Enzyme design. Structure first.
Site, short mmCIF file in Angstrom:
data_model
loop_
_atom_site.label_atom_id
_atom_site.label_comp_id
_atom_site.label_asym_id
_atom_site.label_seq_id
_atom_site.Cartn_x
_atom_site.Cartn_y
_atom_site.Cartn_z
N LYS A 178 125.92 77.97 45.65
CA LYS A 178 125.79 79.42 45.46
C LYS A 178 125.52 80.16 46.78
O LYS A 178 125.63 81.38 46.81
CB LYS A 178 124.71 79.75 44.41
CG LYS A 178 125.13 79.40 42.98
CD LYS A 178 124.04 79.72 41.96
CE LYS A 178 124.43 79.27 40.58
NZ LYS A 178 123.40 79.63 39.56
N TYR A 179 125.27 79.41 47.87
CA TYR A 179 124.93 80.06 49.16
C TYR A 179 125.89 79.70 50.29
O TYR A 179 125.80 80.39 51.30
CB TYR A 179 123.49 79.77 49.60
CG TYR A 179 122.44 80.39 48.71
CD1 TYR A 179 122.05 79.76 47.56
CD2 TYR A 179 121.89 81.62 48.99
CE1 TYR A 179 121.15 80.35 46.69
CE2 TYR A 179 120.96 82.22 48.16
CZ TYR A 179 120.57 81.57 47.00
OH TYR A 179 119.65 82.13 46.16
N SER A 180 126.75 78.70 50.13
CA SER A 180 127.66 78.34 51.24
C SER A 180 128.85 77.50 50.77
O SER A 180 128.85 77.01 49.67
CB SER A 180 126.93 77.55 52.26
OG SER A 180 126.39 76.41 51.66
N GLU A 181 129.83 77.37 51.65
CA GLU A 181 131.02 76.53 51.43
C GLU A 181 130.95 75.48 52.54
O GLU A 181 130.70 75.83 53.69
CB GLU A 181 132.29 77.39 51.52
CG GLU A 181 133.48 76.79 50.79
CD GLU A 181 134.57 77.78 50.39
OE1 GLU A 181 134.97 78.62 51.23
OE2 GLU A 181 135.05 77.68 49.24
N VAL A 182 131.16 74.21 52.19
CA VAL A 182 131.02 73.09 53.13
C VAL A 182 132.34 72.38 53.35
O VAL A 182 133.04 72.02 52.40
CB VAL A 182 129.88 72.12 52.71
CG1 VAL A 182 129.71 71.02 53.73
CG2 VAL A 182 128.55 72.86 52.53
N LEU B 137 134.53 70.07 51.22
CA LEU B 137 133.72 69.03 50.58
C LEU B 137 133.00 69.56 49.38
O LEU B 137 132.71 68.79 48.46
CB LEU B 137 132.69 68.42 51.54
CG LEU B 137 133.25 67.80 52.83
CD1 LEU B 137 132.11 67.37 53.74
CD2 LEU B 137 134.15 66.57 52.52
N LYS C 150 129.16 74.22 57.52
CA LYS C 150 128.56 74.94 56.38
C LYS C 150 128.76 76.44 56.64
O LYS C 150 128.13 76.97 57.49
CB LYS C 150 127.11 74.49 56.24
CG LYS C 150 126.30 75.16 55.16
CD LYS C 150 124.85 74.77 55.18
CE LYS C 150 123.99 75.40 54.11
NZ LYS C 150 122.59 74.93 54.22
N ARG D 10 130.89 73.44 47.55
CA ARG D 10 130.44 74.81 47.60
C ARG D 10 129.28 74.96 46.64
O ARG D 10 129.37 74.52 45.49
CB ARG D 10 131.57 75.77 47.19
CG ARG D 10 131.23 77.25 47.42
CD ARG D 10 132.45 78.14 47.44
NE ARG D 10 132.98 78.36 46.10
CZ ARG D 10 134.20 78.80 45.84
NH1 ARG D 10 135.05 79.07 46.82
NH2 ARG D 10 134.59 78.96 44.59
N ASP E 12 113.64 71.09 48.94
CA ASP E 12 114.83 70.81 48.14
C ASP E 12 115.15 69.33 48.25
O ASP E 12 116.32 68.94 48.41
CB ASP E 12 116.04 71.67 48.55
CG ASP E 12 117.11 71.75 47.47
OD1 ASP E 12 116.79 71.42 46.29
OD2 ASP E 12 118.20 72.27 47.76
C1 LIG Z 1 133.13 60.66 53.61
O1 LIG Z 1 132.67 61.21 52.38
C2 LIG Z 1 131.61 62.08 52.42
C3 LIG Z 1 130.98 62.48 53.59
C4 LIG Z 1 129.94 63.41 53.53
N1 LIG Z 1 129.33 63.79 54.75
C5 LIG Z 1 128.37 64.73 54.99
N2 LIG Z 1 127.86 64.58 56.23
C6 LIG Z 1 127.04 65.53 56.63
C7 LIG Z 1 126.72 66.68 55.84
C8 LIG Z 1 126.01 67.88 55.85
C9 LIG Z 1 125.11 68.45 56.89
N3 LIG Z 1 126.23 68.57 54.69
C10 LIG Z 1 127.02 67.82 53.94
C11 LIG Z 1 127.49 68.23 52.64
C12 LIG Z 1 128.48 67.70 51.85
C13 LIG Z 1 128.51 68.45 50.63
C14 LIG Z 1 129.27 68.40 49.46
C15 LIG Z 1 129.05 69.32 48.44
C16 LIG Z 1 128.08 70.31 48.59
C17 LIG Z 1 127.31 70.39 49.75
C18 LIG Z 1 127.53 69.45 50.75
N4 LIG Z 1 126.91 69.29 51.98
N5 LIG Z 1 127.34 66.65 54.61
N6 LIG Z 1 128.17 65.67 54.11
C19 LIG Z 1 129.51 63.91 52.30
C20 LIG Z 1 130.11 63.47 51.13
O2 LIG Z 1 129.70 63.82 49.87
C21 LIG Z 1 128.56 64.67 49.76
C22 LIG Z 1 131.18 62.57 51.18
O3 LIG Z 1 131.80 62.16 50.02
C23 LIG Z 1 131.25 61.00 49.39
#
Ligand SMILES: COc1cc(Nc2ncc3c(C)nc(-c4cc5ccccc5[nH]4)n3n2)cc(OC)c1OC
Length: 327
Positions: free
Chosen positions: A47-51, A43, A66, A45, A154
């Site tokens: 500077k501290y993790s890949e998601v 989904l 994460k 990345r 943040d």
């Molecule tokens: C179904 O589509 C999506 C679902 C999600 N879901 C989601 N749910 C929980 C959760 C958590 C705890 N961390 C992230 C996350 C998504 C992400 C994407 C880029 C960088 C860091 C990121 N962190 N997510 N993302 C996120 C999305 O964009 C950020 C997304 O695209 C629109």
């Protein structure tokens, strides 16, 4: 030197808790099985993790993994402790598991998945009622974590997951979150540029929960005025100049004078002299349906230089702007 400062609420919550609550370094991590999760797609990345989006093969539920890069692998105990302390809290993302990634050999945090609508797309379609409803949902999360002695540090649109279909909101990415301890000097290199509070931009280190209320104010300004981000600085110095062009330079000088802060000398040639702007200057035919006297009064009480003068999350939830929201 600088005048000290303390939060006006939840001041001593951590000192009344057993050290096990806030002494995150002493925490023993309970590990799960990495084989329970099958990675589906990357989904993003930072500077501290890949998601990654993943599937928990033991219940076929969608999850998000994460994977920490060793640069944040170091302070993972802080993030884990904070997520475990806040688990079950209103609108706080649920940490479902902690596993060891077999490829990075680092910790991988497994979270609940939210069916998020990209904020850039979602903010354009938000109605005046939707903004009030979502802001109240964010406040529930913020008041809970603050009441638990934790500062998010943040708050920004990227860290607020919204499932617009089910009107469900989660506050994510607790990697920068910290336990608040009165009189502690914190790192000012937190939050994202457009949502950094003046305390970070003027290098005032004894900040508290109120930093998240400035960040929330910036998000509200972007949603009601349809300008994202509202304060669009080119760097941390210009970020403060952008703020001063709206809030004025006199209140800025009064704020630095009150805390006995010495402004970085580079600001002398870029800050200028500006008066506070009335919030109607930002109103135009395209955002007028999202602006009301209650919205402007509420925004005015969040976007204050003096962190001690900003509304607390509980005070914000009592504001008249939320009277129309069904509770
Ligand atoms: C179904 O589509 C999506 C679902 C999600 N879901 C989601 N749910 C929980 C959760 C958590 C705890 N961390 C992230 C996350 C998504 C992400 C994407 C880029 C960088 C860091 C990121 N962190 N997510 N993302 C996120 C999305 O964009 C950020 C997304 O695209 C629109």
């Amino acid at each position: 030197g600088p005048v000290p400062s303390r939060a006006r609420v939840y001041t001593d919550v951590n000192t009344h808790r057993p050290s096990e609550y806030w002494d995150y370094e002493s925490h023993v991590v309970e590990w799960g099985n990495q084989d329970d999760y099958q990675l589906v797609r990357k989904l993003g990345r930072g500077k501290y993790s890949e998601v990654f989006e993943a599937i928990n093969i033991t219940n076929n539920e969608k999850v998000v993994v994460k994977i920490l890069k060793p640069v944040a692998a170091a302070k993972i105990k802080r993030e884990i402790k904070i997520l475990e302390n806040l688990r079950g809290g209103p609108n706080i993302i649920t940490l479902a598991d902690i596993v060891k990634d077999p490829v990075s050999r680092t910790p991988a945090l497994v979270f609940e998945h939210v069916n998020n609508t990209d904020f850039k797309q979602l903010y354009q379609t938000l109605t005046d009622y939707d903004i009030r409803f979502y802001m109240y949902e964010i406040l529930k999360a913020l008041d809970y974590c603050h009441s638990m002695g934790i500062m998010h540090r943040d708050v920004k649109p990227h860290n607020v997951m919204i499932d617009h279909e089910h009107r469900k909101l989660r506050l994510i990415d607790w990697g920068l979150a910290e336990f608040y301890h009165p009189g502690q000097e914190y790192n000012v290199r937190v939050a994202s540029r457009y949502f950094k509070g003046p305390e970070l931009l003027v290098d005032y280190q004894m900040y508290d929960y109120s930093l998240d209320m400035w960040s929330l104010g910036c998000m509200l300004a972007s949603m009601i005025f349809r300008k994202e981000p509202f304060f669009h600085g080119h760097d941390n110095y210009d970020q403060l100049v952008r703020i001063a062009k709206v809030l004025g330079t006199e209140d800025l000088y009064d704020y630095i004078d009150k805390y006995n802060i010495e402004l970085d000398p580079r600001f002398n040639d870029i800050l200028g002299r500006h008066s506070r702007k009335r919030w109607e200057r930002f109103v135009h035919s395209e955002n007028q349906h999202l602006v009301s006297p209650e919205a402007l009064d509420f925004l005015d009480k969040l976007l204050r230089y003096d962190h001690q003068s900003r509304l607390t999350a509980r005070e914000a939830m009592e504001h008249p702007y939320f009277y129309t929201v069904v509770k």
